[PDB]
């Protein structure tokens, strides 16, 4: 047997048209937001991590100077640790804010990918799916490096 050659119905439900364009506009909009938010989040985690190991080194030094310092000095070292602590906190706060935003962008990108899949747009589907995949990979890795630094700060406490 051979397939039946056909064609006649336009397959024109307004809903069909709206749904297909919606899928395309949204996959693009989420692509944009995912890249943009992933960059901002990674950058904030990197800046936060810097604030962490800075405080870690401040502690390692203060610990090294235990005894060697005297009254005023021990106090001056501490004011620096106080200001450093505050910096790390502010960077942490910013990083958590952007982590939530990235979570939304990722969720929204997955929605679009699934929709493109449902509507048969495999190309847009796979691209977005591969993109989400990469972005998740990189953000997990930077977070892990970030945990390493946090552990060393703790150990230095």
């Amino acid at each position: 047997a051979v397939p039946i050659a056909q064609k006649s119905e336009p397959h024109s439900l307004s809903s069909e048209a709206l749904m297909r364009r919606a899928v395309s506009l949204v996959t693009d909009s989420t692509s944009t937001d995912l890249s943009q938010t992933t960059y901002a989040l990674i950058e904030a985690i990197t800046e936060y991590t810097k604030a962490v190991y800075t405080l870690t080194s401040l502690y390692r030094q203060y610990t090294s100077l235990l005894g060697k310092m005297n009254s005023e000095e021990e106090d001056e070292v501490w004011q620096v640790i106080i200001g450093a602590r505050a910096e790390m906190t502010s960077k942490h706060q910013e990083y958590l804010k952007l982590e939530t935003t990235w979570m939304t962008a990722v969720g929204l990108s997955e929605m679009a990918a699934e929709a493109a899949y449902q509507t048969g747009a495999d190309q847009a589907s796979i691209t977005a799916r591969n993109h989400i995949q990469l972005v998740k990979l990189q953000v997990e890795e930077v977070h892990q490096l970030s945990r390493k630094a946090e552990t060393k700060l703790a150990e230095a406490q």
């Binding site: 602590r85 906190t89 502010s90 942490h92 706060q93 990083y95 958590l96 982590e99 939530t100 979570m103 969720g107 977070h143 946090e150 703790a154």
Partner: protein
């Protein structure tokens, strides 16, 4: 899914109460899913994103998460529905 997966760990959350000047217990707060926001006694749940302030001397953090944010799925996973329901009575 949590709003802040990075704070899904207890140790991550308790690390935020390093310098806590309030009587509300920080281990209990961290156990109930909260991490300090770094201002006042403001805390927020890593999962539902719910924030609480103005704590009282002897207050139960889990009691307060169930009170104010009964819909938190971290809360029911840890305390169950009857617990949350009892709080709403």
């Amino acid at each position: 899914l949590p709003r802040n997966p990075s704070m899904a760990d207890y140790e991550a959350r308790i690390f935020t109460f390093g310098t806590w000047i309030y009587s509300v217990n920080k281990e209990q707060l961290a156990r109930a899913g909260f991490y300090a926001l770094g201002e006042g006694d403001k805390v927020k749940c890593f999962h539902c994103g719910g924030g609480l302030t103005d704590w009282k001397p002897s207050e139960d953090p889990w009691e307060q998460h169930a009170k104010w944010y009964p819909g938190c799925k971290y809360l029911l996973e840890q305390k169950g529905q009857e617990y949350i329901n009892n709080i709403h009575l």
